[PDB]
């Protein structure tokens, strides 16, 4: 099997993206959450509530003779027929540890069977509501979830961009993410529906561990995707994330133009 | 010298920093503390009349407290506008017939949101109606007819009795007939035909009233490019009612004229009445020698001609008429100032595509999708962007506008310099970043000023237009965020298709349109496009850049919208100080 | 000059078809069984004479809940019909019978066959289906190829329809327009016999996006509805009709000609096993072990090759085969929709796979996915109008005439048509929904319901030719 | 036997509408000429003059100048008529205040109209005509909550329908409810736009807020609201007009696109759907495509429209969506009993005047006359009125029974036909006051072969037959005057004498489901009104509450509609008296003016 | 196909920059596919256009 290299990562920012895609490298947990506060927060089932289910179980649905559908194994919410369900997630632009597109590259590396849209303001992913569940403990618990700058919201998710409140917390018109002596919680669910108690997340990242684990480019931090001087200067004297950017217009401009131009490119 | 962004070159305003009354600098505000819709003089206003329009028509309407789980729109600050560049202005201060003359150099400012609304805005509105309602022919063709099968000399004489004639006609009267239905003359006051020609001699024979005056309108290097086109012929440029256009659509036009200068002929030239040369008339008006600002639309989104989708962007380029003002003649200090044309021609070209097509034809709702496109118009943004990579160019490339050799290589250095700088700004101003809240804005931003630096440059539309695409790497690998869930569609199908030349893939820039397949159905990017070639032919020293025709059609003082400054024009409905055309109150009750 | 390079035709179990195939072969201007397929699409319509019969007997005619009203109880109305009541009400009968046409669906058959056959030898088929209620029709090349157009099948089969009952009832004049409104629905007020009893595969001739895009205009629903759920058949299908609809399009020409043919060989129709080699490989992982599947199985057959290091160790690869790169990443990405809704086994997700299949594909070699830019593109409008207010709809709506999927250059709608073909039932408007009549009558068409063995067989009925 | 004529004498206010217009007994055959001064004569035209040189002045270029008429002729050297619209004098219902104007004084004429007041181009009443019929989109409900209830799972429930319809009323013209910063209409622009529901379930109906109900007990008689919520059944139908003003900006096809937009919002918000769940796509294909009804049907290239043009529209959508048939006019007018010619001449109003102004000229052609002295005639001054009475009150007495039940033979049309055609005939003949009123030779062929159609329609309950009875007066008319109409006029009705019962491709089709895309039908005036009016008649005289489309008929029963369906000919005469308030004006946006 | 293959082998047989695609596509095909038609183009049938 050939080996993934996921993407170029000459320097901390790269680096940080390439360990949030590799599947191959475990996202360390930062936070326990208990049963029922984890699903009152994704706010689609609560504790003990029977699983819904949009189709019969996979095994009654009489599925065709198909040689190529035996060699994908069904997921188990798929073999049960759960509801397809979606978790909404937001990254500020300010030095989060996992941002929109890398949420894209991760989920397509990471978990089986999904459906997953990237905006500039929020990041879906839709799957059969077991096997979303179980991918919600990686996005809620884990070091890509900075409760004060990655935050679920189902709807009226507008904050992403704007500028962080006195606490240095990102906005959310229906404020359901909160500070409270310290710590980050959830005093309404992702829906913004009540919650019988609040969900506790913990502290923030300090702003240095933030610049540290950090997978966007900032150029107020001296960090830009593009530095002074790197227009029209040659590959070498560049980021690599700009080489490989060069590239992939040059190779889709003649490629398109011509396919056979690219050959030996 | 600061960016336009945080001082506007004359008056010095602060566009970003009027907003919240702090410092954009800092990446702190507080939020949930502006009373809701409260802060809105508009929202608040149209939450007491929509109390009103209940309790008199027996349904309820706008209600801002049924906003999703209890929390009102304006939890954050509800942005006010300045329009771009407005101080910067020192022409144009005629009266037009939608409001007195201007004063160049006025400020707009403090706009709401809902002011910049196509559905609230009557001078985007008349924008379009005005391209629409154009019916554009050569007369040569009926002119021959008349001689040739009718046996009557054509001369300037005989051409001013039939333009007289179909100036009564057009809109309010009838010439020919007895006991004969008119129009009210109030309700198409907006309504009249006029005429253009190469012919200088013909010209000065010709009542002026009728004239779209070429050596008047234009500078005189265009009005020689213009006259050297159009040549020794006749072109009718005709403008049926607003109302007309309001009944139904924009392919009214070329059959209305064709019904109304048909009569205009037969009565100018004593035809009787049914005799076979008739049909020659119509004919040559609706098909036999004809231009029309849009083209027709294939069945899924069936038009005829003349709807926002079928007009080309160098149509839409064109019909702008920013190419020939003191602004953009002489704006970069006395020199021709491309980046005045770009801005200006976009601002029709992003509102009509957008907000007059793509939402109020291909989709819609009450929101216009507003504050997507008032971004590229407003607080010197997109200005200070594009004005940077221009002074980039010149100063790295020791040389004017127009004058970069077209290499991709130097599209992509310009490119990666312009996008630099975007995010540059973007990223050292919270303030800014929270302005333009919606990624599209700031993606569609970098790639507009890239392209239009590009453009302006090099003078090539379609390398202007390829360092629109891109941005997406730039601006993606830099984010980690683009725009709205289906914006790069058109970006990154175009990294490819711009110098493809497959069947439905390659087609020069000035003739692509919104029904180009890849541009058929996102905001954000037309308009730019628009921009950019009408600047890029601004540049290499031309007086449009696609059609001349249609320079010439809409060079006329009798445009209900001034095509020559439209962002102040948005502004000044935006202040509910635009009077449009197609209003009925001559034959409705008092209000 | 030919398109002489050997290609191995495998099958969907893995196992292989036809050795030793030149790629000229399986285009569709050579092939015969992908030519007979758009011969089929031309020349078949169903003949719906229940839905005739009911529209004559209640006035339920054409659709949108049109209603021609009879009343037969005017008497019991409380109404005067006379002035001041001088003669009692009596009810009438103007816009309805009662034909029974599906009881003498075997007779009208004969008659139907009998009033298309231009030659008694030339080929014309009517068959009586549903217990009645539906003919299936193909008419013959000689009457087919008369014109220039290709809804001969559909505009013969309705007049033929109209005059042969209203002959073998001998109805009276009232009838005709009735009769017509039976089989023709609201034509000619629309173009389309718009709720009308007369269907074509085919969209109306006048809903095309450009020249060429007939055999575009097909939704994946109707595809996997005829191939009834057999992932990669619906996949061949698909793939094959949009080659011929390229083909049309002036696409499959000159210095793209190889590039396009690759792609309808190496994704719709398994080209040495690329597809299922991938899909088993991966089966078990996500759409980046696909990714990874691909690029390893470009690496293994030579056609891409480490073009340059990077200071970091990050690689840029190079196209040995440009065209043949493009077509390993069309067969990855319908592998990697295989996988990915396979998995959930709901097709939601395909829009999601489309995109970030190619978009991990470029960050992982330097090399441009797809149509260069076309996959992105159809992944970024595919996703949007499948899960937002604007437009569009569930994946199987879509097709290679819809404005939002039209671009790639057809290797978008394969992947609908494999993704629409392993959900479970998690659309309301699935298969059954806007397909049952298609599947059910053109699904017994054993060309149309499984075509990879029947190009594979035609292949090699002419591989030495080449 | 015959009363006497009602152009002559109307029945309750007793004005003579012919003589009205010469102030001379019209059946004398005398005028003099010449001698009124020309345009001077007109109000209309002497005040469009002063207005013209204030016009002229203002923007420097000259436009109406009746001294242009040709070789110093000014129009006006006859009488420039004036007109009273036909039956107002007959009306006792109606009198509720509209959205356009207060409550109409049932039986109150509208006389004296100058031919300019009744112009399509300068009358706004007919222009909310159509902007109504055109911004309407109707939608089955059905598919959207099935949607919700198995793919999202949660329950659908009166409770939510009404907060459904709460949140779309809020957002169909003005607002917003999930987004932060976000742009909304003044709703002052928008006042006009709205969204209702009906069914045919009756508990259903009584637990929804009846705001946003379109009441089928309440608007039509039990005999019509029986068969219509039979034909409803157990489900519910959305009734959602977007703004006029938006339509003005664009086309009908927009209407469909507009509600695809906000009732997808409406859903997500009452539903409390993630933003960017895939079950969103299924609410704008519902609403565009999946389970919905349109006033017009897509047209050709040469003519290319996307839905909800007016060229798209079914004769029988027309016929449909006149509110005349549940008036107690056409309920019990006619002595106690139905009356299917008042139908008739009201559904054939805005019939002609929207196919022929608002479609043939302000799409097709086009100018400044509207074509308007063409279609004034066919619901002015009771001339056609008299004519189809004639016709009706004529077989009543030979067949010896009511509406809608003579035999629908061939020979019983071509007898009322040809009595018909001898009645109009006779008193143009014998009046030349009446024949110079419509100097036009189209108005009077055209009136006299409506005539014969609205009696055989109302006489047997049969559409086509009475359209077949149109056509036939073409020999009955030539063959009498040696003159037909216009040019072009007897293009449809030379072909149509053998289209009406052929079964070829584009010829055969049942006259409900014609329209202005019917190739014969695709050019001339004169015509469609008149069909729709004996396809609504029709129905009406055999006992239906509809002719083609029960959705439409009740779509159409809905008092905030800016224009009064029910009474036509009236609201056209309120416009001509500039007394009908349109929707659509942008005022709350523009200078004081 | 007539369009395609005089665009493909005018770029091929002039070696043309990758400037000219655009340009020799207009030349055959005119406004096509902003327009359905190949309006104004150099490629011309008896037969109206597919959508007429
Ligand atoms: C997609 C298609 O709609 P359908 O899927 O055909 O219903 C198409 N609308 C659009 O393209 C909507 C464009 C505006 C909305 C997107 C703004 S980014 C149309 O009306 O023909
Ligand atoms: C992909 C490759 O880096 C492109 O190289 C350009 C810089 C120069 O192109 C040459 C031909
Ligand atoms: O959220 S989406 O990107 O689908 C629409 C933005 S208006
Ligand atoms: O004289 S014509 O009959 O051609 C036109 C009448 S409006
Ligand atoms: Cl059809
Ligand atoms: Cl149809
Ligand atoms: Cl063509
Ligand atoms: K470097
Ligand atoms: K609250
Ligand atoms: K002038
Ligand atoms: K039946
Ligand atoms: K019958
Ligand atoms: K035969
Ligand atoms: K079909
Ligand atoms: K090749
Ligand atoms: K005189
Ligand atoms: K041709
Ligand atoms: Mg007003
Ligand atoms: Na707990
Ligand atoms: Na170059
Ligand atoms: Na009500
Ligand atoms: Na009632
Ligand atoms: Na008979
Ligand atoms: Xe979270
Ligand atoms: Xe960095
Ligand atoms: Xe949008
Ligand atoms: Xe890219
Ligand atoms: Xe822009
Ligand atoms: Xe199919
Ligand atoms: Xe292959
Ligand atoms: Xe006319
Ligand atoms: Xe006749
Ligand atoms: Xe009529």
């Not at chain 2, 009838?174 to 006029?194: F, G, Q, R």
């Not at chain 2, 890029?536 to 809409?554: D, E, L």
Request: proline share 5%; charged share 25%; glycine share 10%.
């Amino acid at each position: 099997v050939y080996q993934r290299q996921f993407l170029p990562a000459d320097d901390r920012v790269t680096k940080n993206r390439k360990k949030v895609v590799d599947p191959s490298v475990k996202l360390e947990k930062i936070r326990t959450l208990s049963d029922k506060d984890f699903l009152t927060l994704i706010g689609h089932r609560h504790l003990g509530e029977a699983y819904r289910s949009v189709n019969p179980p996979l095994a009654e649905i009489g599925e065709p003779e198909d040689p190529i559908r035996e060699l994908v194994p069904p997921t188990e919410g798929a073999k049960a027929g759960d509801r397809v369900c979606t978790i909404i997630m937001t990254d500020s632009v300010y030095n989060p540890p996992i941002a929109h597109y890398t949420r894209a590259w991760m989920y397509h590396n990471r978990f089986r069977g999904i459906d997953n849209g990237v905006y500039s303001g929020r990041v879906t992913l839709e799957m059969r509501e077991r096997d979303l569940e179980e991918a919600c403990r990686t996005l809620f618990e884990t070091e890509i979830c900075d409760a004060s700058r990655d935050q679920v919201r189902q709807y009226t998710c507008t904050g992403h961009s704007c500028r962080l409140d006195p606490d240095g917390m990102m906005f959310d018109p229906i404020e359901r993410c909160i500070m409270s002596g310290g710590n980050v919680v959830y005093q309404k669910d992702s829906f913004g529906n009540p919650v019988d108690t609040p969900i506790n997340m913990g502290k923030p990242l300090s702003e240095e561990e933030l610049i540290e684990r950090t997978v966007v480019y900032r150029t107020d931090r001296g960090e830009p995707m593009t530095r002074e001087g790197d227009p029209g200067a040659p590959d070498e004297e560049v980021r690599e994330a700009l080489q490989w950017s060069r590239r992939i217009q040059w190779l889709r401009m003649l490629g398109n133009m011509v396919p056979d131009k690219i050959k030996g490119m | 010298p600061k960016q336009l962004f945080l001082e506007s070159k004359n008056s010095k305003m602060n566009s970003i920093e009027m907003k919240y009354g702090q410092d954009p600098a800092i990446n702190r505000a507080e939020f949930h503390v502006y009373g809701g819709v409260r802060q809105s003089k508009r929202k608040s206003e149209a939450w007491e009349a929509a109390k009103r329009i209940t309790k008199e028509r027996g349904i309820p309407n706008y209600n801002p407290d049924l906003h999703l789980k209890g929390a009102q729109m304006g939890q954050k600050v509800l942005q006010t506008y300045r329009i771009t560049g407005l101080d910067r202005e020192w022409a144009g201060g005629e009266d037009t017939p939608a409001h007195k003359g201007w004063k160049p150099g006025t400020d707009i400012a403090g706009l709401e949101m809902d002011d910049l609304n196509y559905e609230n805005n009557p001078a985007m509105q008349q924008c379009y109606d005005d391209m629409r309602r154009t019916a554009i022919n050569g007369l040569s063709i009926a002119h021959e007819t008349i001689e040739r099968r009718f046996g009557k000399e054509v001369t300037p004489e005989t051409i001013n009795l039939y333009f007289e004639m179909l100036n009564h006609n057009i809109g309010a009267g009838a010439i020919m007939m007895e006991h004969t239905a008119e129009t009210n003359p109030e309700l198409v006051k907006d309504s009249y035909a006029k005429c253009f020609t190469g012919n200088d001699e013909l010209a000065d024979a010709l009542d002026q009233r009728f004239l779209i005056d070429i050596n008047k309108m234009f500078p005189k290097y265009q009005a020689d490019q213009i006259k050297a086109e159009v040549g020794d012929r006749i072109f009718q440029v005709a403008r049926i009612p607003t109302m007309a256009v309001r009944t139904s659509d924009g392919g009214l036009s070329r059959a209305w004229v064709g019904q109304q200068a048909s009569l205009a002929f037969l009565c100018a030239y004593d035809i009787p009445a049914g005799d076979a040369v008739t049909s020659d008339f119509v004919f040559t008006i609706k098909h036999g020698d004809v231009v029309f600002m849009g083209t027709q639309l294939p069945y899924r989104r069936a038009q005829r001609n003349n709807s926002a989708g079928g007009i080309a962007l160098g149509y839409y380029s064109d019909c702008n008429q920013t190419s020939r003002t003191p602004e953009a003649l002489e704006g970069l200090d006395g020199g021709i100032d491309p980046v005045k044309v770009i801005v200006e021609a976009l601002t029709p070209g992003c509102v009509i595509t957008d907000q007059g097509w793509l939402h109020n034809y291909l989709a819609g709702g009450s929101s216009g999708w507003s504050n997507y496109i008032i971004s590229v118009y407003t607080d010197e943004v997109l200005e200070d962007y594009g004005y940077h990579g221009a002074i980039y160019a010149m100063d790295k490339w020791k040389c004017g506008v127009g004058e970069v050799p077209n290499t991709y290589e130097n599209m992509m250095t310009i490119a990666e310099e312009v996008s630099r700088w975007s995010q540059k700004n973007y990223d050292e101003y919270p303030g800014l970043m929270e302005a333009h809240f919606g990624g599209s804005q700031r993606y569609s931003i970098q790639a507009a000023a890239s392209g239009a630096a590009v453009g302006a440059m090099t003078g090539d539309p379609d390398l202007g237009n390829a360092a629109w695409h891109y941005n997406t790497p730039l601006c993606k690998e830099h984010y980690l965020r683009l725009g709205f869930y289906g914006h790069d569609l058109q970006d990154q199908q175009n990294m490819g298709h711009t110098y493809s030349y497959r069947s439905d893939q390659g087609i020069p820039y000035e003739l692509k349109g919104p029904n180009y397949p890849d541009f058929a159905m996102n905001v954000g990017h037309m308009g730019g496009y628009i921009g950019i070639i009408a600047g890029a032919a601004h540049a290499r020293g031309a007086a449009y850049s696609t059609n001349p025709i249609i320079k010439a059609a809409f060079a006329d003082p009798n445009l209900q919208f001034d095509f020559r400054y439209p962002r102040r024009e948005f502004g000044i409905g935006g202040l509910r100080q635009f009077m449009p055309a197609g209003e009925r109150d001559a034959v409705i009750p008092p209000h | 000059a030919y398109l002489t390079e050997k290609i191995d035709l495998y099958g969907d179990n893995g196992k292989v078809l036809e050795s030793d195939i030149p790629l000229e072969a399986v285009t569709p201007v050579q092939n015969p069984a992908v030519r007979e397929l758009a011969s089929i699409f031309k020349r078949s319509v169903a003949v719906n004479l229940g839905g005739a019969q009911k529209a004559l007997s209640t006035g339920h005619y054409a659709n949108e809940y049109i209603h021609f009203p009879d009343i037969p109880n005017k008497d019991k109305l409380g109404i005067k019909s006379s002035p001041g009541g001088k003669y009692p009400p009596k009810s009438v009968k103007v816009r309805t019978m009662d034909l029974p046409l599906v009881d003498d669906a075997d007779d009208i058959a004969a008659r139907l066959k009998e009033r298309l056959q231009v030659n008694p030898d030339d080929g014309t088929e009517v068959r009586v289906m549903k217990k009645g209620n539906v003919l299936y029709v193909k008419i013959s090349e000689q009457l087919a190829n008369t014109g220039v157009e290709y809804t001969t099948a559909l505009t013969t089969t309705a007049q033929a329809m109209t005059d042969l009952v209203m002959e073998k009832y001998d109805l009276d004049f009232h009838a005709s327009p009735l009769v017509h409104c039976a089989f023709y629905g609201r034509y000619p007020q629309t173009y389309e016999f718009m709720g009308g009893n007369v269907i074509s595969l085919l969209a109306a001739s006048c809903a095309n996006e450009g020249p060429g895009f007939a055999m575009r205009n097909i939704m994946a629903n109707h595809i996997v509805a005829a191939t009834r759920k057999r992932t990669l058949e619906a996949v061949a299908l698909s793939s094959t009709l949009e080659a011929i609809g390229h083909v049309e399009m002036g696409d499959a020409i000159g210095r793209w000609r190889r590039w396009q043919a690759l792609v309808h060989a190496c994704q719709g129709l398994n080209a040495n096993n690329v597809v299922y080699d991938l899909v088993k490989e991966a089966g078990h992982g996500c759409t980046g072990d696909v990714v990874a599947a691909t690029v390893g199985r470009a690496l293994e057959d030579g056609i891409i090759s480490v073009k340059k290091t990077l200071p970091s160790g990050y690689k840029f690869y190079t196209a040995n085969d440009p065209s043949m790169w493009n077509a390993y990443v069309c067969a990855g990405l319908v592998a990697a929709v295989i996988v990915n809704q396979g998995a959930a086994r709901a097709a939601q997700g395909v829009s999601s796979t489309l995109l970030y299949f190619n978009d991990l594909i470029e960050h992982e070699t330097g090399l441009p996915h797809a149509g260069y830019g076309d996959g992105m593109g159809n992944g970024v409008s595919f996703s949007f109008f499948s899960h937002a207010i604007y437009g569009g709809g569930s994946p199987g709506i879509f097709s290679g005439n819809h404005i939002v999927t039209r671009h790639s250059k057809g290797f978008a709608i394969p992947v609908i048509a494999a993704a629409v073909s392993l959900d479970s039932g998690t659309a309301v408007y699935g298969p059954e929904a806007t397909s049952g009549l298609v599947g059910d009558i053109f699904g017994e068409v054993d060309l149309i319901r499984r075509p990879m063995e029947a190009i594979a067989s035609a292949a090699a009925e002419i591989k030495d030719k080449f």
